[PDB]
Amino acid sequence: QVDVVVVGAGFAGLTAARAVHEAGRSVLVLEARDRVGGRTCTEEHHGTWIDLGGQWIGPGQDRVAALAAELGVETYPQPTEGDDVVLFGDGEPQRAPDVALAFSDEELTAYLELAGALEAIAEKVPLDAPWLAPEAAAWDATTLREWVAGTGVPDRVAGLFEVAVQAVFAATSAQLSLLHAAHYVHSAGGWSKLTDTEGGAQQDRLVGGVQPLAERLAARLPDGALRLSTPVRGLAQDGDGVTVRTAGGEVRARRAIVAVPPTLAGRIDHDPPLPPQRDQLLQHMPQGSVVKFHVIYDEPWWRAEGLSGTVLCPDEPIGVTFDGTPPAGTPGIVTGFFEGPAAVAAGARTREERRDVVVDVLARTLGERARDVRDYIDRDWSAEPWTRGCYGAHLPPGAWTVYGPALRVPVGRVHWAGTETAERWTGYIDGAIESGQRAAAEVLAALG
Amino acid sequence: QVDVVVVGAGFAGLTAARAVHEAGRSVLVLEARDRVGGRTCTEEHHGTWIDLGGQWIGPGQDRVAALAAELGVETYPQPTEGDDVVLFGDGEPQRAPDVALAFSDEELTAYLELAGALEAIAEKVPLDAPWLAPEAAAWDATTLREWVAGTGVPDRVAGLFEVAVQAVFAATSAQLSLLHAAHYVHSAGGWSKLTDTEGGAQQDRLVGGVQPLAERLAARLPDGALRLSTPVRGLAQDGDGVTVRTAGGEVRARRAIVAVPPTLAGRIDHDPPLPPQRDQLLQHMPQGSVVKFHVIYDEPWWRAEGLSGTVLCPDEPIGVTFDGTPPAGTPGIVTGFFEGPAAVAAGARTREERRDVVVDVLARTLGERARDVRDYIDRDWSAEPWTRGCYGAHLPPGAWTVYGPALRVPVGRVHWAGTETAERWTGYIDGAIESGQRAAAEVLAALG
Ligand SMILES: *Cc1cc2c(cc1C)nc1c(=O)[nH]c(=O)nc-1n2C[C@H](O)[C@H](O)[C@H](O)COP(=O)(O)OP(=O)(O)OC[C@H]1O[C@@H](n2cnc3c(N)ncnc32)[C@H](O)[C@@H]1O
Ligand SMILES: *Cc1cc2c(cc1C)nc1c(=O)[nH]c(=O)nc-1n2C[C@H](O)[C@H](O)[C@H](O)COP(=O)(O)OP(=O)(O)OC[C@H]1O[C@@H](n2cnc3c(N)ncnc32)[C@H](O)[C@@H]1O
Ligand SMILES: NCc1ccccc1
Ligand SMILES: [Mg+2]
Ligand SMILES: [Mg+2]
C-alpha cells in the first residue's frame, strides 16, 4: 500500500515523486532500466564523461538551471570560437566565423524572412491548447515542407533550413504538421532559441554530464522508494485505487503518474482500456530518429587550425557537429548526429560502418587529421527498448486538432507526465521537469 | 513444442493456420477475444444478422469469393434501385436516379480526370515495394490533400472527393501520403473498384453475416488448436524456436506468425527487441477512425417513396448511407459511418447523442419519418482494445520510403501477416486471406 506510484525514473518521473515525498505522502517509482535518467545517459570513457542522450541547457530553461544550482552541479559553456565549415551539394567547403556568412546577400535576407514568418505563426499557437489556435484547422492540414515550398525561397536556403529542422525535430519537414512545428517554436520562445549556441538551447553543458544530476535528484527520495529493473506491464484501476502489475508482483496505490514516452505509455495493459481518443493520439505521436555520436581524439587538433569543430552539410548523412571537448581541454571530442532518414539507414549498419561514414565527412570538411581517431562511441535511441526514439514525439498532419486534446486530461486515477506534455520547452529536460511539477499538483489536490 | 504458433484469429491468422494444418504441420492459434473474426463481428438483433465489422465483397476479390463458396456461405446483392438524395450545406435536399446526376457536366468531368490522374500515379507504384516507385521520394513527401489542391480542380468537387477518401480510408486527405493513397488504389485495381456498388467493393453481402464464415474456417482446425481469451503478452526467440508468454503460461514453437493490426504487434513484449526500423514503422502505421451504425425501422418505409436509402451530404458528420435491409425485406435498416475527425468526435459522446445526430441527417434527407426509430446499434472500433481503429492502417508522409521496407521482412523465426501486409485488396477481407496464404507458404519453406 502507497499513495502514489510513478512509472518512469526520467527527469519527469523523479520531479513528480520528489514533490509527492515532500508533502509527506508515500511514493513508489517503478523504472524499467538498471538506472535513472531515461533519455539522459552518461558513461565514463578516456577519463571524461560521455553524454549519450540529453546534454545541453540554455537561457529561458529556468527549471533545469534551478535544479542544477540546488543539487550543486556547475555548468561549462559550449565552445563557440573559431570558423564553422558549411558544405552545400555543390562547390567547396566554406570557412566563416558564422554559418550565416556562408549565404549570399539575397539568401540571408530570404532565411531571416522565413524564420520571422514561422515565429509569427508560432506566437498565435497557445502552448496549453495548440488546437485552439484560430487557423488550427488549415495549419494542422499542412506539412512544414509544403509551407516552406509556399514561401518562394531558393534551394540553398531550404537546404540549410532543413538541416536545422532535422537537428531540432529528428524528423524531416515532410513528417511534421505546420501546427506541430509552430507550437514547438513557441514553446522554446522562438527560432533563435532553438538554433543558437550563445543565447540559445545549446549554450551550456553540465560538469560530469546529466545522468549524475538525475542520480542526485533520486538520492533526495527516501530509501525503498526507487525500484530499478522493474518494468510496469499492467495498470488496473477501480473506485478505490490502482494495481500495478510487474514481472511477478502487484503494487497497490490510490493514484498513478505515468511518465514514459507516448509510444511506451500505449504499450501498457490498461484496465479498463484507455478511452478511444487517447489510444489513437499515442498512435499519432511517433518518436524521432537520431543516432548521437562522439569521435575521440588525443587533442582538440582543429582549434589550432582556427576551426570551431562545427561543420554543416545539407547533402550528407551527418547533419551538424559540435566541439564536445571537456574543460580540461583533452581528450578532443567531435559530437554529431544522424537525423531522420539518415539515422534509420545508419541504425541498420554496424558501429564500425557508422564510424567510417562520420570520419569520411569530417576528413572532407575539418581536414585529413580527422582520420587519426582514438575512439568512436555512438547510440541509436530508436534501438533502446525503453525509449524507441529521440529526442521525443512529433505529430504529423491532422493529429493535433483531432486527437491532441487528450494529451494531459487524466483518465480516472491515472495522470500523465513526460516532456511531451510540457507547455514550455516541450522536448527538452526543462519540459520534463515542468511536467513532473504539474502532475504532482493534480494528484496532491485529488488525494485531498 | 508445435511447428507454428499464430497470433490472431482474424481471416489472416485463421487462413495461415488452416494452410499450415493442410500441409501436415502442428499449429496453435492464440486469440485475445472470446470469439474469432477480429474486424468482422456479427450479432443477432430483430431476427436478422448485424455486421458490426466488415460486411461487403465485390468482383476482383477472388480469395474471399472462393472461401465463401468452399465453406457454403451464400451471397445477396446490395440493393441499388430508387432515387439517391444529395444535400449541400444550408440548401434543400435533391432526389436524382444516381448521386452523380446532382452535379453539372463540367463538375462530373473534373471528378473523373481527378480519379483518372490518381489511377495514372497508382499504376506506376509497385504493389510489393511502393518505396521503389520512380518518383517515390516526391510522392511520399506530399499529402493526398496537397496533390488534390495542386491539381487545381474546383471546391465543390474536392468536397465530393473528400467524402469518398473518408469512405475508403477512414482518415482525411491531410493525414495520408500520396504514395500510400496511390498504392491502395493500384492494390484494389482502380477508384471505381473502391467506390462503386454494382461492379465494385460494395456489390455483395453474405447471408447470415461475415463472422459465421470465419467460424466455418476455424472449424477446419483440430480440437485444442484454437485458444480463445488468450491474449499474447510476450514473444521470445532464439536459434531453436520461439516462446509465447500468455497470462495462463507458455507455448513453444519453431516459428511464429503475427496476424494482428500493426499498432498491437508493437505492444507485444518482443525478446530480443524488434529491430529499430520495424518498431518505428509500427509507430508510423496508425489505424483509421470509424463508427459504424445500423438504424432499425419496422419496414424499409423509404422504398415506398422510390428512395434507395442512400444519402450523400458532404457537409454533415456522417458519410454515405446504404439500404442494409436483408432479403426477407424486414426489418428496415439504414447503414452508415462516422469517418476520420467526425468518428473521433462521435466516439467521445454517448450512444443516444450519436443516434440523435444520425436521425437528424436522415430526417432532413430521407424524410421526417426517420425520427420514429425502433433501435440504433453502432460500434466505435477505436474503443476495441483488440483492434484500436478500422478499417486499417494508413501511412503519413515520409513513412513508406523510410520505414516501409520492413513491412513483410521476417525477424528471425517471426513472420508477419494481416491485411496491412497484402499486395492485392490491402485493407479488405480479401487482403487478410492473401497475407495468411503468403505467411503460411514462407513459414513452411523456413521449417525445412
Ligand atoms: C535521446 C536524446 C534526447 C535529447 C537530446 C539528445 C538525445 C540523443 N539532447 C537534448 C539536449 O541537449 N538538451 C535537452 O534539454 N534535451 C535533450 N534531449 C531531450 C531530453 O533527453 C528529454 O526531453 C528528457 O530527458 C525527457 O524526460 P522524461 O522524464 O520526459 O522521459 P524519459 O527520460 O524518457 O524517462 C522515461 C522513463 O520511463 C522508463 N520506462 C519506459 N517505459 C516503462 C515502463 N513500461 N515501466 C517502467 N519504466 C518505463 C524509461 O526507462 C525512462 O527511464
Ligand atoms: C472494422 C471494419 C472493417 C471493415 C469494414 C468496416 C468496419 C467497421 N468494412 C469492410 C468490408 O465491408 N469489406 C471488407 O472486405 N473489409 C472491411 N473492413 C476491413 C476488414 O474487416 C479487415 O481488413 C480484415 O478483417 C482484417 O483481417 P485481419 O485478420 O488482417 O485482422 P483482424 O480481424 O484485426 O484480426 C486480428 C486478430 O488478432 C487479435 N489480437 C490482437 N492483439 C492480440 C494479441 N496481443 N494476442 C492475441 N490476439 C491478438 C484480435 O483480437 C483479432 O481477432
Ligand atoms: N536537444 C535538441 C538538439 C539536439 C542536437 C542538435 C541541436 C538541438
Ligand atoms: Mg561560433
Ligand atoms: Mg443507386
From TrEMBL, chains A, B:
It comes from the Bacteria. This is Monoamine oxidase. The lineage of its organism: Bacteria, Bacillati, Bacillota, Clostridia, Thermoanaerobacterales.
